[PDB]
Subunit: 353 residues, 4 copies
């Protein structure tokens, strides 16, 4: 007799995938108030951040100005690779010359990516991010492994992106110092629609963590974060840091000029797999768009950490490590409606909503 | 082999959370007609109300005028604490001097909250509501316990808010005379989005009740009530009273002036954790907004009790205590669409819809 | 350890409720083409209709003109009771004098309802419909029983409305000749919102049928039917006839004048529990609104039967009795989107969509 | 004790139906990059295509121009039958005279359909598509069988449409060379609403394949495909080719003139069961509408194959046959929201979104 959803193979539909909106954190016994929570966390095996946030390696998000401001806010930036090797390495130099700030840089896969990585390491980069659509591909695992054996002593090597336990386990055996999770949840991403491929971000973190935690390897949750609450959910699912693109793209520090359409303020934000970024045989997996202007980075980060601090008070988590042990309740479409404010016209501006 | 939603921990996603919209009451055998239902119910262990409704302790909802009108309608009001101690206590005096009416007042936690509580008790308040975001926090449980031991004989002490069985059990062992349930369902609340924390209100009541009912402690369902039907659902899930903010904020008795935008009538309604209420390092967990003007309180309460009376006739519940034994059917997104009127342009105004 | 949705009572949430939109009929082996399907079916134990459709007893739907046209189309009408007893009985006379046409009439419960029923029976009505919000109430069951014992020989007695197996079983033991199912699915109904009470219509039919079919008592599915496809679903769930309000209210034969707002054509349609119908202590359980004008009844019925005929060809059902043995597939929100036409601007008018 | 959704029959609701939007492909270990994927696949038992795509047999989609362009792009077209037999056969001749291109043609059931098929076979058609609403009907199975025995040696015979395992098994025993799947998922289809009949397309493919694969008979997934990602999902569910209507209707090669409403470009697209196509006793099962103009076919096909190539790289599938072994993760409504780009205003045009 058949599997309820079709066919005679119970593993054809392997699992049920949950995203951030499908779940809430459960309040627990607490001796923690928001002010006394400690928000520090491992970016990689060797690098601990004061604030568990990293800015995305995208040409509309992180250049030296964002990397500097992020590091000073206690987080880190990853410099995008959509520029010539000399300029990317130069921006690494601009950051390290602003007071020994932490900084990462993305590279792709191949000989040119190899030359890029070597120039970044010479410029003093702290973290190399091997930055690909599908980390489970053999080329990526080999590139991670070779950087690891070659520099490794010198620098941390992160690999992404993955959406499964087996892929995270493969990066760990390749020697990854951290594993970055997220195939298709990005706000500007179209992978799930163009290729039909991906995994909902909460389930993707839970699965990657089932592989990375036993190996002592930290998980970076990347993409799909829209609110401070999602950061707490990603960390409680077992991630150690979160990487943000659209939440940080509207900020003053993000590269790009202010757009003034309708006497309203916007900034361009685009996928690195979008047509405008890659530059007609290209098949793009991202879109180009715009986000509201959100003002200074510092005040965006204060709001995000403040929301995370509230979640730690609610779950009784004095540190990120205890937050990673929190429980979820799953919700329905109706519970999401309730979870957001409802049945009121919002008349005054809110900083975190 | 994994848990279907991710990882190897079957308790990581502890349960499935239902809100008011996810469920309907099942009709049952009835010898009860709406007119003959008895709507009385316990607010606390010592205090029984004629109508099982309480107005929220919010600066846009309950001041002496609302408390007076609520008590005369057979319910009760809880005076908000966003004012100086002398004025809050003075408003308690204004209410008690209108004919021995019942009244509650909110307090926070701490020495100033202690002084506030002592002035309220001296003014003759009947119920102290310890009014916090997270009742499971140690400070709140201690504050409940100390008020209980100190005044206790004199006054009833309610604690909130909670969303779990263990938190309700902790308030009961601290000596709470009632437990108030609701983390994040409020119409103006942003906790679930800012902190990612909460529990859907039907499941939250069912769980709190599993702890409070064996201890003979009544549950106040607080927040997320939009229609008279939700009140019946909350009571049938085991709550003894319901607390309303937005349903009562549009009324004449609510503090605040009438707003006339578009030749339409509104009243301001805002979270107590909203930016405008608390008064840039604040991290708000509510929004400021507006609700339609709904006219006299008395006629709003008549509609709410009338809807509750209909539910009692449908479920065969002569009293609230029997209603608390009713059954639910769970519905899908499509069943909600059907449950509301559909496929018609509503052309004339309805008092309860 | 708890029930997943809350508490320690596995029966508190008794079941999962499906509505028409949650399910599709499964195609089966067929030697039936739409043209050769036989659409006849039992209205009651004694009365078989050529077309398994009845018009609702509502003041915006069925008066003598609709009853006449319905009967001539092979269905039946139920004359509403929102008029004086002499006029209702007179309309029964107008119908019987148009060629021995079938006709029903609604009555409520009580002595006045008793006098009304006796005048209707004298006028020659074929079916008395005891027409109430909650058939499981003791007054309704007694009224059904007394009419049954008193007239019974003379006339058929239908009872409604019910949403459960136990309520349908109670009407059967009271002597009902048919059981009408539907609490809250009506397009103009607000019971599920005002009282929070009801059951999704597919599950409600399946349950009523589990009680009525073993007793040889036909089930009338009443309310929530928006498309011809829903009629086939209701019959396949085990109903023998369907009762329609909004699908027939836009027709020329429906009482009421044509409304011409925006150079568009509408007809008033309102719940019998709406404020305008019942005529400020009333608590209404319906709304007043308007529906598009749909032209002649005859061509609406042709479309509805044609859709039902297609379903019979698809399921291989030569008769309604075989259709009642068909199977459903349950769908998700995404399957409903797919089921309706999608991703196209509809530019030309369709008669059945 | 009852079945949770109603009644005492566990098979009344036979299964849970998934559509394309309910699922994503899971990334897997890969030694495949998009460029090196091989997209060839069986259309029928005897015919392998370079690109696993077929254009729909609809009067707004496939006439000789589309059939020619499709075949040159490595796919195939099926010429619609809403024209006189001499013109349809003539269009077959126009295609075969453009360099030995592959071509199919639709026929219905009956003697006229028989004469049509014989003229098509004489014109040199490669595939006859027996093109009906319900393939499980006895007339269709006999028509498939008779064509098979009569021509069979000469030509391939495909049968559709089906939505169940038993129906696909019946076509296989009738001698079908391929089975076409899809009852009601079409963008312009109204079967699920008019008749209430159908099955969600992912489950329908899984079930048909459970019957066709053991018999070595290829499955054509037909209808409901809106994005390149859906094609990959349909193939991974076990289909061998996909048939497209609306994705190809906006193209220059599609029959019909360009529409210029609002200084925007559209093309007419309509169901073959729509009122305008069939030409008031007709009961239509489709609508007439319009789709955006999408430019040259060639560049639409490049985008579709490019998306499919990405999915093959992500799942580690060097060929379509390995893709058919990929796994799904099921998603919720919230996961779909995430899967599409979200929380950004799309400002620049995307070729595949
Ligand atoms: C973050 C994403 C999705 C992104 C970013 C930049 C550029 C791209 C473009 C559009 C070039 N798309 C791909 O790169 N897609 C891809 C897919 C599968 C595979 Cl297997 C491969 C591949 O060749 N790998 C070695 C991973 C590439 C995607
Ligand atoms: C009803 C709500 C959500 C509300 C009402 C007024 C003010 C607030 C503000 C914005 C100050 N937010 C918090 O108070 N959040 C909070 C969270 C966790 C905790 Cl643990 C604590 C805490 O310190 N406690 C002792 C409960 C406080 C919230
Ligand atoms: C179809 C509906 C829902 C309808 C139609 C006309 C009028 C009404 C009004 C508004 C008067 N509402 C009720 O009648 N509600 C009701 C509820 C429970 C009960 Cl128990 C009773 C009752 O007294 N019964 C004897 C059934 C009545 C409802
Ligand atoms: C693709 C669809 C749904 C389509 C295409 C063209 C025309 C039609 C019209 C409107 C004529 N509708 C039907 O043909 N419906 C139908 C249903 C069941 C059946 Cl059993 C039969 C039937 O007689 N068969 C022999 C299959 C026909 C449908
Ligand atoms: O165009 C692309 N396609 C798919 N994912 C992308 C693309 N560009 C950036 N990303 C991912 O999306 C993340 C940002 O997602 P967001 O914060 O939800 O906007 C980045 O950190 C990358 O992991
Ligand atoms: O700003 C806040 N954040 C979260 N909850 C709040 C806030 N202010 C009031 N509440 C809660 O929300 C309830 C009112 O919810 P409502 O009736 O659904 O509008 C109150 O009774 C409080 O329990
Ligand atoms: O006002 C009312 N409240 C609830 N149900 C009603 C009311 N008036 C009519 N009904 C029911 O709704 C049905 C019509 O539903 P519709 O065809 O979905 O519009 C009627 O046949 C009655 O069973
Ligand atoms: O009018 C009709 N009713 C139902 N299905 C249709 C009708 N006309 C075409 N189809 C189907 O719909 C498919 C196209 O669906 P689409 O690509 O999703 O627009 C065709 O290949 C046929 O299988």
């Amino acid at each position: 007799d058949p599997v309820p959803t079709g066919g005679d193979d119970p593993h054809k539909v392997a699992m049920l995938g949950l995203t951030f909106d499908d779940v809430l954190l459960l309040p627990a016994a607490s001796d923690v108030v928001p002010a006394t929570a400690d928000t520090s966390s491992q970016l990689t095996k060797k690098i601990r951040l004061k604030v568990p946030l990293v800015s995305s390696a995208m040409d509309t998000v992180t250049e030296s100005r964002m990397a500097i401001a992020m590091a000073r806010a206690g987080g880190m930036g990853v410099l995008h690779r959509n520029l010539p090797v000399a300029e990317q390495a130069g921006q690494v130099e601009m950051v390290k010359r602003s007071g020994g700030l932490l900084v990462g840089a993305a590279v792709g896969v191949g000989g040119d990516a190899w030359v890029r990585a070597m120039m970044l390491v010479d410029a003093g980069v702290d973290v190399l991010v091997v930055d690909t659509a599908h980390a489970h591909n053999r080329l990526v695992l080999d590139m991670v492994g070779k950087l690891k054996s070659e520099v490794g002593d010198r620098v941390e090597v992160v690999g992404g992106n993955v959406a499964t336990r087996s892929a995270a386990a493969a990066l760990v055996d390749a020697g990854a110092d951290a594993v970055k999770v997220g195939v298709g949840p990005g706000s500007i991403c179209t992978t799930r629609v163009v290729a039909g491929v991906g995994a909902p971000q909460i389930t993707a973190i839970l699965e990657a963590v089932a592989a990375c935690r036993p190996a002592g390897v930290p998980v970076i949750a990347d993409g799909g974060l829209q609110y401070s609450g999602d950061i707490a959910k990603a960390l409680a699912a077992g991630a150690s840091t979160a990487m943000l693109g659209s939440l940080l793209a509207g900020t003053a520090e993000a590269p790009g000029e202010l757009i003034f359409v309708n006497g309203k303020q916007y900034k361009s934000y685009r996928g690195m797999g979008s047509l405008g970024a890659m530059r007609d045989k290209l098949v793009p997996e991202g879109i180009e768009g715009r986000v509201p202007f959100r003002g200074p980075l510092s005040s965006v980060i204060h709001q995000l950490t403040g929301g995370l601090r509230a979640a730690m008070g609610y779950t009784g988590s004095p540190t990120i490590e205890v937050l990673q042990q929190a429980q979820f309740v799953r919700i329905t479409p109706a519970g999401l409606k309730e979870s957001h404010p409802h049945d009121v016209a919002m008349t005054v501006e809110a900083p975190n909503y």
